[PDB]
Amino acid sequence: TXNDTXX
Experimental method: NMR
DSSP class of residue 3 equals S
* Backbone dihedral region for residue 3 (phi beyond 0: left; psi -120 to 50: alpha; all else: beta): alpha
Q: How far apart are the first and last CA of the chain?
A: 4
Q: How far apart are CA 7 and CA 1, in angstroms?
A: 4
CA 3, chain centre distance (Å): 4
CA 1, chain centre distance (Å): 5
